[PDB]
Ligand SMILES: *[C@@H]1O[C@H](CO)[C@@H](O[C@@H]2O[C@H](CO)[C@@H](O)[C@H](O)[C@H]2NC(C)=O)[C@H](O)[C@H]1NC(C)=O
Ligand SMILES: *[C@@H]1O[C@H](CO)[C@@H](O[C@@H]2O[C@H](CO)[C@@H](O)[C@H](O)[C@H]2NC(C)=O)[C@H](O)[C@H]1NC(C)=O
């Protein structure tokens with residue numbers, strides 16, 4: 001398994017078309033992870049198209065109380 | 072009130088469990104401790120370096136060589152150890168400046184999140200900030216940010232203004248929404264439809280200027296009183 | 300605002316000793332200096348990656364603008380991505396990109412320019428289609444005129460003021476966007492901060508390389524020349540003087556890199572705060588998100604930095 005990347009050439013992992021969140025940063029948008037060891041292009045996030053129109057409004061009908069920690 | 076209290080209690084229990092189970096969340100203070108220990112360990116270990124001299128033991132250098140050359144060797148040892156010590160001090164100064172910046176940020180967070188409610192978005196956690204709670208930790212502080220998060224949204228048809236008797240009525244505090252046949256005025260962050268009256272709307276101008284203005288009646292509370 | 304500098308790494312033994320093994324053996328007597336240099340540079344690199352991540356990765360969703368781009372007369376073509384352009388960069392972003400130009404290595408950044416462009420496009424789509432609601436929870440759509448009426452009401456001006464002269468406000472906004480594009484394309488020193496970052500890095504590297512030709516009080520600056528013209532007993536002295544000079548130069552370089560990394564980290568923290576408090580919401584802090592009463596801000600990606608349109 002030999003893969004050529006922008007940061008260098010990586011030996012020991014195979015490139016996978018599937019995209020996951022970054023696990024071990026490599027460089028130039030490529031990350032490696034252990035599922036054997038695989039290399040992939042990191043995914044920024046899940047796409048979400050907002051239903052925009054000039055006469056539609058979305059109003060929340062409920063709420064949730066959230067607690068988060070900052071260190 | 073009961074639902075909000077239950078949600079708050081469940082959230083606190085969940086936070087306790089999450090800290091109990093996730094080790095990597097509390098990694099910043101551990102990194103501080105590791106950095107200090109590693110720097111001190113490296114400084115100690117540097118003592119066993121020859122620094123270009125023949126021996127790393129100072130008294131061995133005195134004893135095994137003549138003083139004319141032992142002095143040069145000891146000068147090399149002394150300058151090497153001074154270089155090591157000043158490198159340690161410089162790195163400590165830089166790290167101390169970083170920690171001072173972090174502590175200033177922590178004090179600002181305390182003042183603006185714990186001692187009051189902050190309108191700054193994302194400063195006191197994700198969502199609309201309600202209140203915060205401080206907790207002490209080794210070499211640091213932990214904040215418990217309580218936030219309000221909207222949920223279960225619903226589609227509505229909205230209009231900038233309502234045209235009535237040739238007058239344009241704008242929402243005093245809320246927005247105009249319609250469920251398909253009737254129009255109501257509701258507050259922006261929570262769905263509470265209400266009858267559009269003259270008490271929760273204000274009039275400004277005629278209907279030929281506003282774009283998207285729609286036709287609907289506006290109830291007047293006073294009319295039934297003098298009707299009788 | 301600058302966000303990150305270039306991730307650089309140095310080969311200690313290669314920089315100081317070339318291809319001489321005796322020089323490396325002599326260096327082995329000096330302890331773990333090269334180890335400290337490696338640790339410092341690795342920390343700087345991961346710090347740069349973290350700076351970019353904190354500044355730009357503020358949303359967990361990738362929002363898309365609707366195909367029908369009519370927002371009540373407001374023209375956003377100058378800041379929205381250009382599908383015709385292969386790089387999918389906005390015209391202002393393209394102008395910004397155009398206007399900014401051994402033993403030593405430069406590590407590529409973790410996030411490519413396309414990913415940062417996608418982040419900025421997601422931020423713009425979220426702040427255009429959903430107002431500021433997407434920064435505090437689920438994205439709730441709202442017509443742009445009503446969002447702008449919200450923002451006018453935020454600064455103490457009633458809704459009717461905006462609704463009665465919407466067309467004038469839209470024309471003023473479009474003219475302002477055109478003027479800011481022209482001002483960026485005309486004034487050459489507007490982007491001086493990022494260029495100073497690039498120039499400082501290049502100058503530091505060039506000075507470090509140039510220092511390698513200094514005699515440092517020895518008879519020659521060439522290592523093989525000394526090893527070939529002199530017998531050992533004074534050769535150790537000459538080589539020791541050379542290698543101690545080169546450790547001084549390298550340590551000075553690392554110290555300045557650490558200080559500059561701290562400065563860039565402070566700038567990146569400021570940029571992240573500005574993103575959160577001006578792009579994801581409306582700020583009442585005066586002179587923080589531009590001169591005057593703040594309405595909304597638009598982010599634009601730039602080399603080694605970010606540009607805010609207040
Ligand atoms: C409000 O209405 C819009 C459109 O009527 C909804 O958007 C649709 O969502 C479905 C679900 O994926 C898509 O298949 C459609 O293509 C969307 N339509 C448009 C025009 O984008 C939206 O989901 C509704 N909001 C809620 C909360 O139900
Ligand atoms: C808002 O959401 C809460 C939950 O987050 C809803 O509370 C639930 O109500 C149903 C029926 O009343 C109960 O069966 C559930 O056990 C409740 N959940 C909890 C956690 O107690 C509440 O009903 C929602 N409000 C509206 C108007 O839909």
Ligand SMILES: *[C@@H]1O[C@H](CO)[C@@H](O[C@@H]2O[C@H](CO)[C@@H](O)[C@H](O)[C@H]2NC(C)=O)[C@H](O)[C@H]1NC(C)=O
Nearest residue numbers: 248249250251252253254255263264265266267
């Ligand atoms: C929109 O909401 C209004 C008020 O909530 C609805 O009007 C009422 O509808 C109920 C049930 O259909 C009737 O029993 C009432 O008599 C109605 N009130 C009046 C004053 O007419 C209306 O039906 C809703 N429209 C839709 C499409 O759901």
Ligand SMILES: *[C@@H]1O[C@H](CO)[C@@H](O[C@@H]2O[C@H](CO)[C@@H](O)[C@H](O)[C@H]2NC(C)=O)[C@H](O)[C@H]1NC(C)=O
Nearest residue numbers: 233234235236237238278279283284285286287
């Ligand atoms: C809202 O109500 C006004 C007043 O009835 C409507 O204006 C009328 O429009 C019709 C047809 O366009 C004209 O023949 C009348 O002379 C108008 N009356 C006045 C007083 O101007 C208006 O069209 C209504 N809006 C909508 C969308 O139907």
Ligand SMILES: *[C@@H]1O[C@H](CO)[C@@H](O[C@@H]2O[C@H](CO)[C@@H](O)[C@H](O)[C@H]2NC(C)=O)[C@H](O)[C@H]1NC(C)=O
Nearest residue numbers: 368369370372373374375376377390473476477
């Ligand atoms: C929005 O702005 C763009 C450019 O700022 C406008 O595009 C111009 O359109 C006119 C005529 O339609 C052309 O003569 C110009 O050459 C165009 N400029 C550029 C840079 O392409 C556009 O018309 C405006 N309006 C809309 C709805 O997009």
Ligand SMILES: *[C@@H]1O[C@H](CO)[C@@H](O)[C@H](O)[C@H]1NC(C)=O
Nearest residue numbers: 053054055282283284367369
């Ligand atoms: C909203 O936009 C659609 C198409 O983009 C247009 O047909 C319609 O007239 C617009 N609504 C108003 C009130 O202008």
